[PDB]
Each structure stands twice: as structure tokens, then as C-alpha cells.
């Protein structure tokens, strides 16, 4: 394993390779420049990026000595044996040759010496600080360390002389993911029509070993697909199956649709099965939401050509049972961005600060595998007004909404975070969240009219057998203040009456397929016990809020310049 | 803040120790309505943790002599919930009010937000500054971003039209600038950020202080 | 114990058996395709599903070397001994042969490295993370893990190379329960008249490990029946009765009626004794409730042929002393689904978010062992509309209402969750929860008329001796404004 295997992190690879190779191949340049080269480097980043692979390539490339020190491998049961093991390892690395020391998983070695309560860990940290910087510290040897969290390292160990250069091996770009895909698909015969560029542009949050997991899952699905024409063959698989196997693009598409990034494995949502034509009506809202999501994740070049950051948030509000959660499911099921779903009061806890810690962890996992899209359903449970309750739990919901306001706009880079709010009452929302920059798209989802109720009834009756003479125009024209939940209730009552008639015909046939589709009598009997969901006062309240938002749009006209 | 005992004050302690070590520095305490919460003593609380946080911040902010010259900056949305014990003269006395922008400030905001943008030469922002009176910089940025989104949509439509007419030539971009029609279409759904009662509350607080 | 013992999870069984068996029988496919197979199994799910049985069958049939590691078995009192024990275990598994390592209950040696406070746990986590994937990590060995909760695991341990393919051995289906019944009743002399199809169809929310408890309870009931009539002969049992013992069908019916799923053992309803014939009158309401309950249970084929989801919710409102709680009890006695009942303020607590956690846990337990029906009693108590108080009590009733609206219709699978609500105050109910999808059927149970009054007078006097000249028509006609409680 050489240096042609950890591609996608070329800048950090060159930054490490310089301070390893240039004071080791030709040190006359550093002897002529006057001073000493740096002799310390600390790798930090997310797990599964390539730090251990880079250290293995460093150990395999150079012909110098290499000593491997693991994290808890230096500890021993004897009182005073871990310091002796560290001293013997350093003396073996210094005495033989100018060598490279690798300290893997340093978080079990440095507990920061201010939070631990033991003695052996502080003795080990003090021995490391003595051997790394002091009298007879280092004689032409370098130390490399790798970790998953950089904040659990001692500030005296994060100093110059011991660990001065901190390389940041983060998530790769699209070209980095394409380079990792080209590296991991160079020892296998794939196809004549495989597209690694579209595969790299299709994934969005994969980092490091997740591309190898994708390739291994695609190859395993190909092996399990090309074993049904032949038998099990417990003795020997003949030479006809070994040649011309082929890994086509459908295996890669199945492995991409059947996997997830390694950081978002905890917040995986259940795969609901909807489409864009399943959400009947709301054509302009659907098109605007779809383009607002798909524009900065497909064409960033125009966005940096115009020199402006794209829009991030969108909030749906209106009558209940209209299609807000259905629009969120349609976004979750087929849009290329990763989906983190979260309920309203789900992230709360009885301890002091655990709710804000869960909010920070959710937002950090959202911005880690960017681009992600977040669905904050029912914002009126955790994000309320501030100072409205006299008796509370010591001001905890205020800290929750302050953490939400800070994480949505603060000292952040704001790479790609798309928050979605779906609240059926926009009065209890804080006025600092509806400010643009956090949630600027306040989309009002109104009640469907006669042209939208027909499309809703056509979308809800998509996968059912229907009468060829049955029309939905009379159902769309009779109901005028109804909703999609009411039309679904009408369809479910008609299906229940059809199932009752079918089981009655089955019982009569067993006493002495009768109902192939839903007839008109089932709809005529189902439309007798059907009522509207929303009343007239709540519709007036929603129109009053919409007219207040339009009165906030005052002094607007054709706007001649 | 932490759920353990002592860590919720030790975090403020070693953050202020890192501030006192690297002198000079600036400690920007953002959203002080969660750290410097009003007490409201009525014999019922969660145990007295926010009181310990406020007391630790007070005894770590009172030991600031002429040496080590640190500076604490705060910025809140609701100024009514800030502790008068931390708003005391001698601990934190300065109070700069940042009002809503006027006509010239709105024109300066519209000129500073459009710095690195390929703007039209025959385009003025004085009509946008005059037609909007109670707007703010956030919704002005929203207006500019919607105009850029409309220009990007027009560029995508022109690019797919060019691809269709090539499969069945313009310049390097068919829309090299943001036209006036993009701004006129982006200002169609241009709401305002702040309401009227919040301005009354902020004016009442500015008249009280 | 073999591979024909864990039937019921075919996809998870194949997904484990593929990477267990294929790189050991013939590796020519992997040598031709060039790539290396995955070497990590994480079996998560509900407790009592078959992960330990799968590991035992893998240990019993696969001829490679095996090494089982318990959760808190490597932990020792010496400083630096648990990591040495893990290193010695891995070097022993790597030294002999290409082997399989089964680390059971990994929730005790992996506390996520952030919520823990010790040092030995972090060093054990670092030892596992270094020894599982690092420099010269694993020479042709595969690790299998089993856990009851997958969320309290380190995301660095949930990575590719260490634990990559996470199989989901979950709650089985009708054919899976039939396979478990046919597996567990193949060694006993059962009967000549016992069918397993009705037993697999009437069993609804069993986790797969309660089927063996059902058969053991039926066998113990048959043995206890045979021990009381014929004398026990405590010196030595007579061998004539041992040749003809059997297991009859009423023993299985009594064992089904005297058991419960292992997940719903904490919210068990007390044994009330009512009957559909004990609720007089309300024939249309009774047949509509029976339709709404037993159409998606008995006929799933018509619902999956029409391609539509069934209606689940129903609300009962009307005057008190009418039979709403009696209809809920008549549901709780003899429907073909499990029952989970609550009171009004019963799921509320004094801490912050504990009522939300109770709501989420009881709805996850209702939707896990599906089909269940939930009797949300006093929807006026558990659900206000929104923000009705001038001074709030901390902002908790609105959060309870929001969690109810999210759990009844949100981003879930919605397998089978029937919500029965009985209230006597419909003015203080949320219109967002009166909306279809959560509670569509607004059944109004009115005061009885003359015929319903006669039927409830005949039903309340069902088991009593009476005079033969007694005429209830004058009692039914003279009151004309009364109710069932009166
Ligand atoms: N950046 C990367 N480029 C190429 N392969 C990678 C990369 N990161 C991980 N891999 C793959 O994953 C394997 C294990 O990665 P490793 O270095 O042990 O993980 P980590 O990033 O946690 O230190 C490598 O041998 C390689 O096959
Ligand atoms: N526009 C619609 N088109 C199709 N089905 C709809 C529509 N609106 C509602 N429905 C149906 O009614 C249900 C209620 O809609 P939903 O989005 O959950 O409501 P809400 O806006 O309260 O969150 C949907 O899940 C779907 O089954
Ligand atoms: N799917 C299943 N098929 C067969 N037996 C099962 C199944 N699930 C559980 N069992 C039985 O349940 C009992 C306990 O299950 P076991 O594997 O020990 O527990 P667990 O599933 O918690 O790891 C055993 O007798 C086992 O055979
Ligand atoms: N419609 C009825 N039919 C039969 N018995 C009834 C009826 N209504 C009331 N009863 C009797 O009176 C009791 C009170 O009814 P119950 O359901 O407990 O109260 P509620 O109507 O307040 O929900 C029942 O348990 C039963 O004994
Ligand atoms: F960063 Be890896 F998990 F070693
Ligand atoms: F019921 Be919906 F989510 F308003
Ligand atoms: F081991 Be089992 F999942 F309880
Ligand atoms: F009092 Be009953 F439950 F209506
Ligand atoms: Mg590593
Ligand atoms: Mg919803
Ligand atoms: Mg087990
Ligand atoms: Mg009752």
C-alpha cells in the first residue's frame, strides 16, 4: 500500500509527506536554512477517513525503522510498568535508527489530566510530556498520533515541540469521492457501462470506508444474483462462472439505495413509499420546494458565480390534514439529500442540558454529512415564545429555543442545512425564528379547490381497481370545504363497504371474485357519513394570519424603476 | 452547561482561564438570555443550577483589574430577561442600541450585499430603498437571494434550451447579470421580518433605559 | 441445534449465512471478483428473537474455530487486565485457524466514549477499536455481535470493517410464527386433532420466544391434568399412562388465554368479565366497532388487493352513564387483538419530558407487537386544544398534545394502531385530533329509546332468578328519560 491509495486528501497527504520525507531524504536543505524541522503531527477527524491507512502507507513507503504503539497496549498491572514500557519503546525507537513512532488512539493515553481521578493515567501523561519535550527528549525521531476526538487531548500535549502541526483530514469532496471510487474499483472487472462520476455525484455524505462498503455490497449482491442459474455446488464451482462475471450499474444502484452514511446510522428513518404524483395538488408549492432543495446540491457553480449563499429554511403552515407531512415524506423518499427526521418533543430529557446536547448533536450530525435536510415537525412544542410562562422548570424551553436560534444562525459555516417546519398553528412560534436567514420561506398551504380535489382523488385512487363508468367530478364538486384527510376517509369507507360486500358474497357462496372493483353504490353509501375536518372559525383564523402576513407585505405594486 | 455536578461551573471557569491566558482576547457571549437568566425567586426551581451559573459568571467577571485587559461582548434578542445583577454599572455598563435601518442605511445595506455580484449597469437600488420602509437586512438578503435563485432558474432553462437546440450558440452564460425583472419577481413575495408590537416593546425598553 | 431451528427470519438468516459460509466453502468467487467479503455482523432487535440461537447454530455447524466472549467477562480488578484479556482472546482466535468471534452483549463494553465517566471503559473501547481495524488488524477472522439496543454503541464501532452489515432480526409474521410452531412441536407426541394454522393466526404480538413458553405451558397443563385424576405413585410412576399422554387442543387454548407477549407484560389489563351480549342495545354501534376492529385483522388480503390502508381510530362521546367504558371492556374481553389501556392523567409525570417519554414508549410498545388497540380514556384530560391557560404550567400539556398528534399520525410505518377514545366533554378536544387519520369516526352514543331500554333491562337481568309474571314493558315505558346507570 503506497501513496496512491489515500487519494481525496491530497493536501493533508502532502503536508504529512513533506515533514516525513524532506528531513529524512535530504536534510542538507534544513541544515542550510538554519533551524530544525517540526517533529510532531497529530491526525484528527471523523472515524473512517484514512488516518490509519495514511500511517500504514508511511510505515510501508519509507525504509526506516517503525515502532507501533497502540492506545491501551502500554498499560500493565504492575505499579510502574507503563512508564517503563514507554521508556523502553522510546529508547528502542531512538537507539536503532531515526524512526517514526505511531501512537494510535491517544484518547486512552491522555485523559487531559484534569478530569481523571486516578494516578497511573496522570503518571503516563507526565511520562509522555517528559519523554516528548525536555532534557534528552528526541534525537532525530518523529511522532505521529491519530484520534477521533481532538478535544480530549491535553493542552500541554497540544503544544509546540510535542504536537505542533494538526492536520485536518475531513470529509472528501465530490472529486475526492470519485478518486476513492476509482481507487477501490481498480482491482475488479466491473462493466462497459458503469459510471463512477454519476455515482460520485449521486452520493452526498459518504466518507472514507463507506465507499468500500458500497463497492463490497454491490459485489456481494452481484455474487448473490449470479448464483441462481447454477446450483449450490458444494464440491467446486466450475470455470464457466469464474470468468465474465461483471458488476453492472443496477447492482451499484441497489447498493446505493440499500445503504447509509456511517455517521447517520443512528437517525435512520423508516422508508415510506410515496412519490411526487402521490401528493395530489399543490403544484406551485411542490415545484418551489423541489427546486429550492435541488438547486444548491446540483449547481453550486452558478451560486459561487453570482457570489451569494442559497436559501436554507422553509416552513409549512395551514389547516391540519393538508399535505405538509406528505410533502416531507415525498422529500424524504426520493431526493438525493440525506434525511434526518425528528419529532417535536422527542429530543427533550429530564436532566440539565441533555436537551441542548441532543439538539447540538442532531445539528452536528446534520452538518457533518452535508448536504442534509432536516424535518422539524411540530415546532410549537420546543420552539415557543420566551417569557410567556410564570411557572416553569427553571427556564429550559428558553434554553432549547436559544440553542435552536444559535445553531440555525451563529458562528457557523452554514455549508448545507435545510430545516423544514410543519406547524399547524403559527401563533405560538417565536418571532425570531420566522426571521429570514433561519426560516425565510413561510409557505401557506391552503385548502384544495375543485381542481385540486379531483387530483387528490386521482392520486389516492392510483393503485386500486375502479369502475370504468365511475367519475370523481361529482365528488369533487359536491365537497367544497373538505380536505385530503376527508377524501381519504371517504375512500376508506368505500373500501370498507366493498370489503363487507365481498365477505358477504363469500359467506353466501360458501353457504350455497364477486366484487372486482368499487361500484357507485359504495361511494354513495360512504358519502353519507362524511364531514369536514376544519371548522369555519379556524379557517377564518388562518385567513386572518395570511392577511396579516400580506399586510406585512404593504407598499408593494408593479414596482417601476 | 452539563448535567454533572461542578462541570457546569468548571466550563465557565476554564473558558475564562483560557481568556485570561491569551491576553488580550474578546469573549463573545452570544444569546445571554440562557446564561444570564432572570431569577424570579418564588421558592420553586429546578434545584439552583442557573443561580450557580450566574454567581460563577459574576465572581469570574468581577476579578477584572487593569491587567490582562479582556473584553466581554453580549448580543441578545430579548433584553427584558437579562439579569440586572449582570447589567449593573461597574460590571457591564455599556448598552449600544442597534435600530432599524433608515433610507441611507438601507441603501448602504443593498450596496454592501451586492459587492461581489455581476450586477446590471442599468440598475439602481434607490427604488428598492424607497419602496420598503420597515424592512431589515435579513429580508433584504432574502430578496437578493430570491433574485439570484430566479436568475439561476433562468440560466438553467436557457442551458437546457441550448442543449435541446444543439441535439435537435450563446455566450458563456445567457444571463450574465441579474436583470430588473428578477428583482421585480423576487419582491413579489417579500414580507417583512419584525412585527409592530416588538418595535413597541423595544421602544419602551429604550425609553426606560 | 442446526440451521433448521431458527426458521422465521429468512432474509436475516441468509444475510448471516452468506458471509459465514461462502468465504469458507469456496473462495474462488472472491478471488475472481478481487474484492474482500464483509467481516462484521451486528444482530439488533427486540429481546427474545433468535440472535443467541443463530450464534449457537453457527458455532454448532460451521467447522471453523469458535470463540464466545460474554459482555462483562473480560473485566478484571487489575489496572490494564481487561485489554490484555481481549488481546489474548483475539490472538487465540487468530492463532489457531480462520475463526469466528461472537462477542455477546456489547452494550457493557461500549458506552459510546462520551456519556461514560470512567477510564477503563474508554480504554476497553480503544482496545476494541484498535484491535478490530488498525495495522495488521484481522487475518481472515469474522466478528459477530448481539445487542438489545443498537443506539448505545460507538459510531466508530458501527463502522465498515468492524461492524458493517447490521441485520434486523425483528418481530415475525404469521408464516414465521407457523414455522416456529412447527419447529417447536416436532419432537413431542402432540395429537391427531391439533392444528397449528389457527394457533399461528390467533397469535398476534409474540416476539418468537414466547411460542416455546406457550407449548411448555400447554404441556405442563396436560401433565397437571393427568396427574390429578390418576394417582401420582410417588415411589415409581406406572408406565402405562406414559404411552398415551398427548397434547390436546383445549390445553393450547387455555395456554393462549393464560399468557401474554413479553413486551406487554408491564401494561397488562386486569381480567374483566363482560360479553358482547352483556351490552344491551346499540346494535349499529356494536357492529360498526366490530367491523372497524376485525376487518384488517381477519382479511388482510382484501386490503392489500385494494391497495388501501384501513381506518383505525374511533371516538366515543355522549352523556355519562351510557356504555362507552362498557364498550371498551367488551372490546378488551374478546377481540382478536391485544389491549393496552390507560387512564386520563395516568401517563403524566412531574419531570421534564417524562410524560413524553411515557407516551413514546407506550406507543412504541403498541405498534411493536401489532395488532393492538389503545383505549385512550379521558381525551379531555390527556389532550387540551392548545394554549388555553393564560399562565402556563411550564408548557407541558401542549407538548403532550403535540406528541399525541405526532405518534397517532406522523413519520411512522403505521402498521396497526387502533385508538379508542371515550370522553364526555367534546368541546375541549383539539380539532387537529378530531381530524381523519387519527380519529375519524366520531361515534355519538345517545340515550336509549324504548327498545334499547328493554334490551338493557333484559341484559342487566341476564343472570338472576325472576318471577315469570314480570313485565319490563311498563318499566321501559314509564321512565322515558333514564339511562343505563340509572
Ligand atoms: N480516505 C480513504 N481513501 C481510501 N480508502 C479509504 C479511506 N478511508 C478508509 N479507506 C478504506 O477503509 C480501510 C480502513 O480505513 P482505516 O484507515 O483503518 O480507517 P480510519 O479512517 O478510521 O483510520 C482502508 O484500508 C481502505 O480500504
Ligand atoms: N394533498 C394530499 N394529497 C394526497 N393525500 C393527502 C393530501 N393531504 C392529505 N392526504 C392524506 O391525508 C393524510 C394527512 O396528511 P398529513 O400531511 O399527514 O397532514 P398534516 O398536514 O396534518 O401533517 C396524508 O398522510 C394522506 O394520507
Ligand atoms: N425465531 C425463533 N425460532 C426458533 N426458536 C426461537 C426463535 N426466537 C426465539 N426462539 C426460542 O426462544 C428461546 C430463547 O431464545 P434465545 O435465542 O435464547 O434468546 P434471544 O433471542 O434473546 O437471543 C429458545 O428456546 C429459542 O429456541
Ligand atoms: N348501554 C348499557 N348497556 C348495558 N349496561 C349498561 C349500559 N350503560 C350502562 N350500563 C351499566 O352501567 C355501568 C356503567 O356504565 P359504564 O360504561 O361503566 O359508564 P359510562 O357510560 O360512563 O362509560 C355499566 O358497567 C353497566 O353495568
Ligand atoms: F478514524 Be478511524 F476509525 F481509525
Ligand atoms: F395533523 Be397535521 F400534522 F397538522
Ligand atoms: F439475547 Be436476547 F435478545 F434477550
Ligand atoms: F362516566 Be362515563 F365513562 F361516561
Ligand atoms: Mg485508526
Ligand atoms: Mg404531520
Ligand atoms: Mg442473547
Ligand atoms: Mg369511562
DSSP string covering A277-300, please?
TTS-S-HHHHHHHHHHHHSTTT-H
- Write out the binding residues of A: 47-53, 148, 184, 321-326
Closest CA to C108 of C98, C100, C116: C116
| Backbone Cα Rg of chain A | 32
Instruction: Please give the backbone phi and psi of residue B52, each rounded to the nearest 5 degrees, phi first.
Output: -65, -35
Q: A-chain residues within 8 Å CB-CB of C33?
A: 188, 219, 222-223, 245, 247
Neighbour count for residue C329 (Cβ, 10 Å):
20
Question: A315 to each of A238, A312, A435, B51, how far by Cα in Å?
Answer: 60, 11, 11, 36
**What gap in Å lies between CA C293 and CA C296, rounded to an integer?**
7
| Contact yes or no for A224/C18 (Cβ under 8 A) | yes
Nearest-by-Cβ selection for A440 from B77, B131, B142: B142
Question: C111 to each of A354, B158, C78, C108, how far by Cα in Å?
Answer: 16, 55, 20, 7
Q: C66 burial class (0-12, 13-18, 19+ CB within 10 angstroms)? A: middle
Is the CB of C52 within 6 Å of ligand 7? yes
Q: How many CA atoms lie within 13 A of A375 on its CB side?
A: 25
Q: Which atom of ligand 6 is nearest to the CA of A377?
A: 3
Q: C-chain residues within 8 Å CB-CB of A489?
A: 311, 436, 440
**What gap in Å lies between CA A359 and CA B2, rounded to an integer?**
14
| Contact yes or no for A7/A180 (Cβ under 8 A) | yes
Instruction: Please give the backbone phi and psi of residue B189, each rounded to the nearest 5 degrees, phi first.
Output: -115, 45
| Contact yes or no for C383/C401 (Cβ under 8 A) | yes
| Contact yes or no for A367/A415 (Cβ under 8 A) | yes
The number of the ligand nearest the C-alpha atom of C148 reads 7
**What gap in Å lies between CA B106 and CA B104, rounded to an integer?**
5
| A350 vs B: CB within 8 A | no
Grid cell, residue C329, equals 371492556
Grid cell, residue B128, equals 428598492
- What three-state secondary structure class fits C377? strand
Question: B111 to each of A61, B192, C130, C200, how far by Cα in Å?
Answer: 55, 19, 55, 74
Task: Fill in the DSSP letter of residue A109.
Answer: T
Length of chain A: 561
- What three-state secondary structure class fits B164? helix
The number of the ligand nearest the C-alpha atom of C275 reads 4
Is the CB of C448 within 6 Å of ligand 7? no
Grid cell, residue B130, equals 424607497
- What three-state secondary structure class fits C131? helix
Q: How far is the CA of C51 from the centre of ligand 7 (A)?
A: 7
Closest CA to A170 of A41, A4, A10, A49: A49
Long-range contacts of C317-320 (CB under 8 A, 24+ apart): C317/C422, C317/C423, C317/C424, C317/C426, C317/C442, C317/C443, C317/C444, C317/C445, C318/C424, C318/C444, C318/C445, C318/C446, C319/C424, C319/C446, C319/C447, C319/C483, C320/C424, C320/C485
Is the CB of A485 within 6 Å of ligand 2? yes
Q: How many CB pairs under 8 A join A and C?
A: 270
Mutate to test the pocket of ligand 7, among C48, C106, C145 (most ligand atoms within 8 A of CB): C48
In the block, residue with C-alpha cell 408593494: A556
| Contact yes or no for C316/C324 (Cβ under 8 A) | yes
**What gap in Å lies between CA A179 and CA B79, rounded to an integer?**
52
Task: Fill in the DSSP letter of residue A445.
Answer: -
Q: How many CA atoms lie within 13 A of A291 on its CB side?
A: 14
User: Using omega within 30 degrees of 0 as the cis cutoff, is the peptide bond preceding A371 cis?
Assistant: yes
Is the CB of C170 within 6 Å of ligand 3? no
Alpha-helical regions (H) of B26-87: 49-61
Closest CA to C410 of A317, A339, A377, A460: A377
| Contact yes or no for A86/A126 (Cβ under 8 A) | no
Q: C313 burial class (0-12, 13-18, 19+ CB within 10 angstroms)? A: buried
| Contact yes or no for C419/C374 (Cβ under 8 A) | yes
User: Using omega within 30 degrees of 0 as the cis cutoff, is the peptide bond preceding B105 cis?
Assistant: no
Q: What angle do CA B95, B101, B102 make, to 5 degrees?
A: 125
| Contact yes or no for C90/C101 (Cβ under 8 A) | yes
Give the residue whose CA is nearest to atom 15 of ligand 1. A50
**What gap in Å lies between CA A3 and CA B176, rounded to an integer?**
43
Q: B-chain residues within 8 Å CB-CB of A299?
A: 152, 156
| A355 vs C: CB within 8 A | yes
Q: How far is the CA of A219 from the centre of ligand 9 (A)?
A: 25
Q: B164 burial class (0-12, 13-18, 19+ CB within 10 angstroms)? A: exposed
**What gap in Å lies between CA A529 and CA A492, rounded to an integer?**
12
C-alpha C279: how far from chain center: 30
- What three-state secondary structure class fits A50? coil
**What gap in Å lies between CA C70 and CA C104, rounded to an integer?**
5
> From the DSSP assignment, how many helices (H) and strands (E) are in chain B?
7, 2
**What gap in Å lies between CA A451 and CA A442, rounded to an integer?**
24
Cα end-to-end span (Å), chain A: 65
Alpha-helical regions (H) of A28-79: 28-33, 51-61
Give the helix/strand (H/E) hosting A375. strand A372-377
Q: Taking the C-alpha atoms of A485, A491, A496 and A497 in order, what is their torsion angle to the nearest 10 degrees?
A: 130
User: Who surrounds ion ligand 11 at CB < 5 A?
Assistant: C 52
Adjacent-strand bridge partners of C417: C372
Closest CA to B202 of B134, B142, B143: B134
In the block, residue with C-alpha cell 464466545: C68
**What gap in Å lies between CA B106 and CA B132, rounded to an integer?**
9
Give the helix/strand (H/E) hosting C338. strand C338-342
Grid cell, residue A300, equals 453550486
Cα end-to-end span (Å), chain B: 30
Adjacent-strand bridge partners of A103: A69, A145
Closest CA to C376 of C320, C423, C431: C423
**Adjacency order of strands within the sheet including A372-377:** A338-342, A372-377, A417-423, A314-317, A441-444
Contact at CB, A220 and C18, closer than 8 angstroms: yes
Instruction: Please give the backbone phi and psi of residue B25, each rounded to the nearest 5 degrees, phi first.
Output: -155, 175
Neighbour count for residue A236 (Cβ, 10 Å):
9
Mention every residue, 6+ apart, whose C-beta is less than 8 A from residue B42: A391
Q: What angle do CA A67, A70, A71 make, to 5 degrees?
A: 145
**What gap in Å lies between CA A73 and CA A105, rounded to an integer?**
10
Contact at CB, B149 and A295, closer than 8 angstroms: yes
Nearest CA in chain C to A267: C151
Give the helix/strand (H/E) hosting A374. strand A372-377
Instruction: Please give the backbone phi and psi of residue A413, each rounded to the nearest 5 degrees, phi first.
Output: -75, -30
Shortest CA gap A309–chain C (Å): 30
Long-range contacts of A510-517 (CB under 8 A, 24+ apart): A516/A465, A517/A464, A517/A465, A517/A466, A517/A467
Closest CA to A500 of C291, C85, C158: C291
| Contact yes or no for C338/C205 (Cβ under 8 A) | yes
**What gap in Å lies between CA B168 and CA B162, rounded to an integer?**
10
Alpha-helical regions (H) of C261-323: 283-298, 300-306
Grid cell, residue A130, equals 517528559
| Contact yes or no for C357/C249 (Cβ under 8 A) | no
Q: Which atom of ligand 4 is nearest to the CA of C280?
A: 3
Closest CA to C181 of C193, C195, C168, C167: C195
Nearest-by-Cβ selection for A311 from B124, B127, B149: B149
Q: Taking the C-alpha atoms of A318, A323, A327 and A330 in order, what is their torsion angle to the nearest 10 degrees?
A: 170
Grid cell, residue A161, equals 515541540
Q: C-chain residues within 8 Å CB-CB of A384?
A: 395, 398
Closest CA to C325 of C408, C421, C258, C183: C421
Grid cell, residue A144, equals 505521529
Q: What angle do CA C310, A319, A556 make, to 5 degrees?
A: 150
Question: A3 to each of A7, A76, C336, how far by Cα in Å?
Answer: 8, 36, 65
**What gap in Å lies between CA B187 and CA B140, rounded to an integer?**
9
Angle between helices C283-298 and C324-334 (to 10 degrees): 30
Contact at CB, A320 and C133, closer than 8 angstroms: no
Give the residue whose CA is nearest to atom 3 of ligand 5. A47
Amino acid at each position: 500500500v503506497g501513496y496512491d491509495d489515500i487519494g481525496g486528501c491530497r493536501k493533508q497527504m502532502a503536508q504529512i509527506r513533506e515533514m516525513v520525507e524532506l528531513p529524512l531524504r535530504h536534510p542538507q536543505l534544513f541544515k542550510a536554512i538554519g533551524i530544525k524541522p517540526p517533529r510532531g503531527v497529530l491526525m484528527y477527524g471523523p472515524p473512517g477517513t484514512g488516518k490509519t491507512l495514511m500511517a500504514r502507507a508511511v510505515a510501508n513507503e519509507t525504509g526506516a525503522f517503525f515502532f507501533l504503539i497502540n492506545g491501551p497496549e502500554v498499560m500493565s498491572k504492575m505499579a510502574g510498568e507503563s512508564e517503563s514500557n514507554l521508556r523502553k519503546a522510546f529508547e528502542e525507537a531512538e537507539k536503532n535508527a531515526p524512526a517514526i513512532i505511531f501512537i494510535d488512539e491517544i484518547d486512552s493515553i491522555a485523559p487531559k489530566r484534569d478530569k481523571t481521578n486516578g494516578e497511573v493515567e496522570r503518571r503516563v501523561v507526565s511520562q509522555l510530556l517528559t519523554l516528548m519535550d525536555g532534557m534528552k527528549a528526541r534525537s532525530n525521531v518523529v511522532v505521529i498520533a491519530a484520534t477521533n476526538r481532538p478535544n480530549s487531548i491535553d493542552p500541554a500535549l497540544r503544544r509546540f515541540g510535542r504536537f505542533d502541526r494538526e492536520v485536518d483530514i475531513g470529509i472528501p469532496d465530490a472529486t475526492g469521492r470519485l478518486e476513492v471510487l476509482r481507487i477501490h474499483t481498480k482491482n475488479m472487472k466491473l462493466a462497459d457501462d458503469v459510471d463512477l462520476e454519476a455515482l460520485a455525484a449521486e452520493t452526498h455524505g459518504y466518507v472514507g470506508a463507506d465507499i468500500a462498503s458500497l463497492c463490497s455490497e454491490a459485489a456481494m449482491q452481484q455474487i448473490r444474483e449470479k448464483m441462481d442459474l447454477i446450483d449450490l455446488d458444494e464440491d467446486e464451482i466450475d470455470a464457466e462462472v469464474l470468468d465474465s462475471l461483471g458488476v453492472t450499474m443496477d447492482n451499484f444502484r441497489f447498493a446505493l439505495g440499500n445503504s447509509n452514511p456511517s455517521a447517520l446510522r443512528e437517525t435512520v428513518v423508516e422508508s415510506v413509499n410515496v412519490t411526487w404524483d402521490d401528493v395530489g395538488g399543490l403544484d406551485e408549492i411542490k415545484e418551489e420546494l423541489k427546486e429550492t432543495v435541488e438547486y444548491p446540491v446540483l449547481h453550486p457553480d452558478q451560486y459561487t458565480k453570482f457570489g451569494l449563499s442559497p436559501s436554507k429554511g422553509v416552513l409549512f403552515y395551514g389547516p391540519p390534514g393538508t399535505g405538509k407531512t406528505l410533502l416531507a415524506k415525498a422529500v424524504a423518499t426520493e431526493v438525493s439529500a440525506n434525511f434526518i427526521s425528528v419529532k417535536g418533543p422527542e429530543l427533550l430529557s429530564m436532566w440539565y442540558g441533555e436537551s441542548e446536547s441532543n439538539i447540538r448533536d442532531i445539528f452536528d450530525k446534520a452538518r457533518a454529512a452535508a448536504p442534509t435536510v432536516v424535518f422539524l415537525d411540530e415546532l410549537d412544542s420546543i420552539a415557543k415564545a420566551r417569557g410567556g410562562s410564570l411557572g416553569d422548570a427553571g427556564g429550559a424551553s428558553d434554553r432549547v429555543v436559544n440553542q435552536l436560534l444559535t445553531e440555525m444562525d451563529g458562528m457557523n459555516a452554514k455549508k448545507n442545512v435545510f430545516v423544514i417546519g410543519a406547524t399547524n398553528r403559527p401563533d405560538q412560534i417565536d418571532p425570531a425564528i420566522l426571521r429570514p436567514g433561519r426560516l425565510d420561506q413561510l409557505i401557506y398551504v391552503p385548502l384544495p379547490d375543485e381542481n385540486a380535489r379531483l387530483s387528490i382523488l386521482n392520486a389516492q385512487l392510483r393503485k386500486t381497481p375502479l369502475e370504468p363508468g365511475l367519475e370523481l367530478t361529482a365528488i369533487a364538486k359536491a365537497t367544497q370545504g373538505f380536505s385530503g384527510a376527508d377524501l381519504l376517509y371517504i375512500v376508506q369507507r368505500a373500501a370498507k363497504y366493498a370489503i363487507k360486500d365481498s365477505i358477504e358474497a363469500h359467506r353466501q357462496h360458501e353457504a350455497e371474485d364477486p366484487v372486482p372493483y368499487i361500484t357507485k353504490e359504495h361511494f354513495a353509501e360512504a358519502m353519507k357519513t362524511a364531514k369536514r375536518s376544519v371548522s369555519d372559525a379556524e379557517l377564518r383564523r388562518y385567513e386572518a394570519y395570511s392577511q396579516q402576513m400580506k399586510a406585512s407585505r404593504g407598499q408593494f405594486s408593479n414596482f417601476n424603476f | 452547561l452539563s448535567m454533572w455536578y461542578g462541570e457546569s461551573e468548571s466550563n465557565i471557569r476554564d473558558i475564562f482561564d483560557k481568556a485570561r491566558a491569551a491576553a488580550p482576547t474578546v469573549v463573545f457571549l452570544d444569546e445571554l438570555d440562557s446564561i444570564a437568566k432572570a431569577r424570579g425567586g418564588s421558592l420553586g426551581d429546578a434545584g439552583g443550577a442557573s443561580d450557580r451559573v450566574v454567581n460563577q459568571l459574576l465572581t469570574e467577571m468581577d476579578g477584572m483589574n487593569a491587567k490582562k485587559n479582556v473584553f466581554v461582548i453580549g448580543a441578545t434578542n430579548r433584553p427584558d430577561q437579562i439579569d440586572p445583577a449582570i447589567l449593573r454599572p461597574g460590571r457591564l455598563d455599556q448598552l449600544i442600541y442597534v435600530p432599524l435601518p433608515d433610507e441611507n442605511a438601507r441603501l448602504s445595506i443593498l450596496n454592501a450585499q451586492l459587492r461581489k455580484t455581476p450586477l446590471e449597469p442599468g440598475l439602481e437600488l434607490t427604488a428598492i430603498a424607497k419602496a420598503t420602509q420597515g424592512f431589515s437586512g435579513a429580508d433584504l438578503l432574502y430578496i437578493v437571494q430570491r433574485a439570484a435563485k430566479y436568475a439561476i432558474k433562468d440560466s438553467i432553462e436557457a442551458h437546457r434550451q441550448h442543449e435541446a437546440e444543439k441535439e435537435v450558440e450563446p455566450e458563456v452564460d445567457p444571463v450574465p447579470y441579474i436583470t430588473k425583472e428578477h428583482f421585480a419577481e423576487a419582491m413579489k413575495t417579500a414580507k417583512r421580518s419584525v412585527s409592530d408590537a416588538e418595535l413597541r416593546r423595544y421602544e419602551a425598553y429604550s425609553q426606560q433605559m
